[PDB]
Symmetry: C3
């Protein structure tokens, strides 16, 4: 970890003096889900480049969403960009110092569960942190008690209540396709998985595969934030050597557009119940 506690304080102090907004909820927008910030009222935006200590991208937007004061990350950071996890998760700790209590994380992922279909929304019930198995963890290094404990529990990371409410809200939305729910596995990237890797991951019990999120959740749980999140299934991963095609970022961004209005609508409603 290359940031001191004071670094975190300085950055939060800077934000508090540049906007009157006082967020209670923070949202990290995954790839293609950035349009969510366009629904905020009384909004104020800061490019990451203008914020002291912020990792290099990228906009941070404050505002009101369906009655709730929020702060959203339009664009996030990734391990595959070369950033260590202490940089990838720097914003989560700043949010805590701002007074945020709940964190919503979203991402684009590849579907491992055969029952999934492109466009599906999968609530995240649990995760598998592969980089963590080898020590790549945002918490690696001396522990800072002002944030949390040395050995944080992670079995209850994704708030159960929020998931119930989430299912309730989706009911009131009157959607034809059911709201999915499963386990998200994170791996480094940036390349897409081979057939052997996809089969393996599925056998490990994962329902969706991605390249982010997990480190943010771990840090959020460590400092005390309530966590909720979901994945937009952007493609069904190739499970056999009879590959009619192969994963590509184009289709991932395409799928991101088709389900924009939908995803944005869902998150907007969930604010009500927090």
């Amino acid at each position: 970890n290359g940031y001191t506690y004071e670094d975190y304080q300085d950055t939060a102090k800077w934000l508090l003096s540049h906007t009157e907004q006082r967020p209670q909820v923070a949202v990290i927008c995954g790839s293609g889900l950035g349009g969510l910030v366009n629904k905020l009222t009384q909004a104020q935006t800061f490019d990451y480049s203008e914020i002291p200590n912020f990792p290099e991208s990228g906009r941070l937007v404050f505002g009101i969403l369906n009655g709730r004061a929020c702060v959203m990350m339009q664009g996030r950071f990734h391990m595959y960009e070369g950033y260590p996890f202490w940089k990838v998760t720097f914003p989560v700790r700043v949010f805590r110092l701002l007074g945020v209590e709940t964190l919503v994380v979203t991402n684009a992922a590849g579907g491992l569960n055969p029952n999934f279909e492109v466009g599906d929304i999968m609530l995240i019930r649990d995760h598998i942190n592969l980089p963590g198995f080898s020590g790549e963890n945002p918490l690696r290094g001396p522990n800072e008690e002002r944030f949390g404990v040395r050995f944080p529990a992670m079995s209850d990371a994704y708030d159960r209540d929020m998931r119930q409410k989430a299912h309730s809200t989706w009911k009131q939305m009157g959607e034809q396709r059911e709201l999915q729910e499963g386990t998200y596995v994170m791996l480094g990237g940036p390349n897409f998985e081979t057939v052997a890797e996809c089969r393996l991951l599925r056998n490990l019990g994962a329902d969706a595969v991605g390249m982010s999120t997990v480190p943010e959740v771990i840090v959020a749980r460590h400092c005390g934030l309530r966590v909720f999140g979901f994945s937009l299934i952007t493609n069904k991963v190739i499970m056999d050597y009879e590959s009619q095609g192969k994963a590509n970022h184009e289709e991932v961004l395409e799928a991101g557009k088709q389900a924009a209005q939908k995803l944005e609508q869902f998150v907007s409603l969930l604010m009500a119940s927090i």
Copy 2:
């Protein structure tokens, strides 16, 4: 590896000139098992801070245990503290240069095998080194032949004889609960595993999960030491989403106390047969 061969020599030379003790056996005490050093006779202690080149913590204690000359590490180092494995395992190589022939490793672990119960003692028959799958290995870097070979075998790491004797000794102890035996899997930490991760690990064939030991064993085998070890089962990991509770370091330390007298007693007897 940031230590030269001379660094290892200098440190061993320093220890040999500050104590008359000449250990044949070395013991690394895991969390909560530190009371073991209190049974040594003609003991001499050195805080790690007073020993040149030693990683920063932490006491090294020399003495006689049930007739055998020993040197024990009261407190060990971990990857989750930010230390690279070449630092975590520095003492093992120093021990070899001191004349030590056998290494006993102990640790606190979470139980994956359903038949295990808190308090159980599980002899370590084999291990799974997850960090090693990605290259995080104390042997990474140019090989130093003065210590061992470039490609060391690890399938016979845990001495079979010692395990037989271990079972024999436990018999003479007249314990009601049987002595367990299984596979130990090491992951980075510092957070506790999620339900998905626990299920996965069990399916990989692991019986107990921890955050240390494996790197020490690998280095000990590389330089020629005989190895024996075991885990104190401090908690039964949550295997379902009907979690009545969740892992916590408090209970781990609590369990460490209840089985202190027992664990300490067992190790004391095992010295006889080496």
Copy 3:
């Protein structure tokens, strides 16, 4: 990645001005397969030490093989030597800048599939990149579009045509033992796997285990090279605690000799069909 684009250019320019050879095919020789370079005609060799920017070993040999212009790496680099993957794979990108279109990779591996026998040749149909699960990837860091895309597909890494031709060619060779085909899994090393690790890997769907290759393939696919490869099964890994013996580098090198003439013969013929 510690090499700039210009570094790659400078090195390729140097090679182009020191030899009249213009390779279309590149071959990376694994351990014990180095004798392959002895069949090249009109050959020219450069020790890696004489080539600007080349990682420290090691010879690069240009020449004609059964009618095809080739460049071969007699000796490769490994993660267990302490080299980051951007160093291990530096040559692959230089080859691309030289005008190479196809890459052949070979290695020595341990057999996981029970049907395999020492000496068997296993064509590589797919792979499992364990280090990649944690982020150790030659592509980690800012993407260089002059080489390839940010998110490269890997499900079609091993050219299907080449595999068909490979099987065809092996037919014309009239060999008694069939040509094997399976999945190669790469782990860091340098130690050999324990029994628990071997069982685990097999259950993940791997047929052979090694310490190289995968990173080279990923980089070759990223910059557009056609890829073909195979493993020489140098030993049957210990799958039970009734180990009659244990893996050793001696036997691996021994097996490498016995199948030299065979392996060398096979590769020589495959050139014809490219």
